[PDB]
Amino acid sequence: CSIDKIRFGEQEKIEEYLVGIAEEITKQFSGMNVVFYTQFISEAKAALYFAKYVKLSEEGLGKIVKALLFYFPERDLDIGKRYVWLERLTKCNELPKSIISIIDDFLVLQAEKHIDQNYSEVSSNGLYSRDYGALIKHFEKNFISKRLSEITLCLTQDKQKQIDFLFKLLPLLSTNAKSHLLSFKSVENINDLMNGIRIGLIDEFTPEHEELIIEYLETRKVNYIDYMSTFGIWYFLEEINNSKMEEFIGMDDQYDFFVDPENFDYKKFIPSWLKNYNDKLLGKIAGNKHMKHHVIEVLKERVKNSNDKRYLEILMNYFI
């Protein structure tokens, strides 16, 4: 169903129930009731999950976004999930200045949690602190994190975990912050390569950058006898012209589909792959002419036999 196109009446009563469910989250997890918790959170998780379709006042959004980001136990709503709950809240209410401050407060704490070298973030969906930072940078473009830059300027080489954490948030840092951070850290790892191409540090992959992709690919090859999908999209998008990755097919089916569409076995094609792609990459897939007829059958099957309306939109907008 298209719930977003369904109007919501009695909006203030919904908001009052949403802020009320927010206050109870803070009160429980700041004198917790373990029996009360097991029944309350399922309602709490769903209420904030469904709040995307609700227009909320700035004061009300502040209370709920504060409880969701800070006082929601990590046991059930992980940081990757908590971002998704936070992200859905931006559908009806564009990120205000009051709300945006709360998110930086979370990042400063996340940086504070990263002062210990043992601490690491756990995400089921693969979303981390760098993805909220994108959400900050998405709504307002020229935002500088004053407190995160302060920790950036006080960084030393010993506290490596802060160095790797702050680099993922590089746009948010100030000019003096990034220059100090760039002096302390250089892009030398395959994880660093993706982070650089995401934040915007590097625009076009250098020959050294392909060498990092090749070396990981041979490392995967010797282990064969999840960054593989990202590499295939990079080649199929023509941003990479190294042309040696044809020697690295066979590990996962997503890679082979992108690198050589003509030789791919589309019985192993997964319909859910189309959902993760973006507009530009979906358009490129439709324009490839090598897999267009094959994916026509896959999408046409899905709209017939599956209830997801995303496939129909993908089929109708791009004719992939």
Place this chain on the structure above:
Amino acid sequence: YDYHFEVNGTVVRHKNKGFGYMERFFELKESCDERSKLSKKQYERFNALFNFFEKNGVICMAKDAGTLNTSIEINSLAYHGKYDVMKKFIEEQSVSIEDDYKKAFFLACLGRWEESYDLYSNIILNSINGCVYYLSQINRYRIYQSITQAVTQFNGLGRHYKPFTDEFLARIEREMTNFNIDDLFNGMPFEFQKKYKILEFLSDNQFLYDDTVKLFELTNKVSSDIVVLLRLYDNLRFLYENCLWSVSFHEFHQYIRNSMSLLIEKAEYERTRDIDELGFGFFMEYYDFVNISRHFKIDDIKNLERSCSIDKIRFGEQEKIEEYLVGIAEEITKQFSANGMNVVFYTQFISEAKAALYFAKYVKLSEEGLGKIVKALLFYFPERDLDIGKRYVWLERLTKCNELPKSIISIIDDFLVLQAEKHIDQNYSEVSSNGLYSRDYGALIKHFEKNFISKRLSEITLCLTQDKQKQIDFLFKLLPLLSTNAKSHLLSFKSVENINDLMNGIRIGLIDEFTPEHEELIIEYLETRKVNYIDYMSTFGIWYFLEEINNSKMEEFIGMDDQYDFFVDPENFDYKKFIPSWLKNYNDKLLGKIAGNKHMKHHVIEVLKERVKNSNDKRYLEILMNYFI
């Protein structure tokens, strides 16, 4: 409540705080060495206990569970529809009162409700353990409820039937006046109420509320499917093997409808969810086929076909399904070829009869069997339930798995000739609720043979005169089946003088090819319409596009109907006059022909793209999907 007895036969310690007797019993069962330690009386008791537990499918504890085999076996002639066998069992003199109880259920199952009520009254008289007495009291009240319901139904509704005499109706009312089924269990001996507490639920008005609420899990989108299915089989086995008449009431039939459907939809959901993530579940057996046949209405099966894809569901025990299908089709011959129709047994059986053959589309049937079902369906099915229009669909569905061979073709030919025989009367006219007539059966034979000529129809056609007009126009719908001599003989009876006779000829299949004369007749009508400018016009336009007409003088009349110029010249057509509603009126062939025209294609694909986005119409979406128009 000392233990849980799960549907797979595993016992779980639940609430007893004393010695564990169920655990001890299973240890005695597995190894025989400790068995000899018991006394002789306890040895024979254990053997009786062991027989009960293996017959009821209770094998061992949960922690000792291994290769579990849960195959449903209902030892009841009534469930399998062995109508002939129960008749023989009823006819035989009954040795014991237990046989009388089985007889009365069989009499109730066979529509002889008056006899079962008398038998149940007889059993109650002679049965005062007292368990059959209680079960007969439950069943006699149930059959009295069925009789009262049937009397109300028959009074409301094709001809006036009086299966129960008013003397019998008045008698059972005086026997069952102010009769309380609720007080029945409480008034039983206190020994019975202790030993047979599990039989109390049969006296309640509703007894499947627990099973229906547990069906909600089948809608969960987050084994259980085996639990619901085995719980269903448990309810079936208890209600049939113990011969309880509540198995024929609306509550149980609806429960089987709810549980079977939700099991099917849940398996359908699992398949689509799997393909979404895995990128390429329910397996029916003989018992599932019987459950769907007996308990589902034709509408209820229809809700199943639209929601899920049963063609993706594989059918097992097809010979047993065939035996069920040849067994049931035999009873239709007995019910209607002879004068053995039981009006009470009619109402319950025809619904199962209709559902079984409708569901027989998905089963592979042998030739000898397929002949029996087809001949019983075509000839011996009463027209009130399965009329001419609906009956072909039942017949045509059997061709999905069984491509029409010669022998079945002969049977349909027999049906067609018999249909021609009834047309000697001018008053006789086929009544179809589906807009579907005897022409469609002949088209089916021509579809499967492409060369079959009906000899007997040819003889009837050659014998025809100008008098019996009802026969002439009837066989014009069967022209492809006739021989050349019959075709030449028949064509002399109609004329194609004016344009109206041409449309009548095109509709009845009188002519399938356009000689140049009809083109002029086609041409003459259009100039009159063009002159009179200041229905058929759209129809002519399609034939020119379908290459039915090669006169090429069609462009003179461009400008009156937006559908006409839309077909005559797609390249020059203005598509702001295009209405998407036309594509809904177009069949498979026409839409496909529009798709491959290489003209008009990008305009209609744009109109279809606009419509689905604005309206989200499934018909528009499927029209765009299948042919890419």
Place this chain on the structure above:
Amino acid sequence: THDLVYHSKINTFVWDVEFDIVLSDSKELNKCYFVKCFNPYRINGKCDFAVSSIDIFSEGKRLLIENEFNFKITKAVHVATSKDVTEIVLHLSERISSPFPIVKEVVYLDWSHPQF
């Protein structure tokens, strides 16, 4: 208008009404209705184009349409409630731009077809 159901597989209306119509030959028919049958998989001839076959019933008996069936509605009566509904029929007739707008009942042969 409470029994009025719009089918979207064929842009027609299902309504429990009768029709009093006159053709182009002044012939009159009283208490007549129509039934539509969606059969997309019908075994068509070389000259069958319409996806729906319609049968016109008057006085409970089907009509054999031997002539042109161009017609105009003179009086439409809703069966359950005898209120005249002719104005609604003509208003609905103009909108749908399809033959035979109001139909007594639509029969769907698609779900029952073995090729479904």
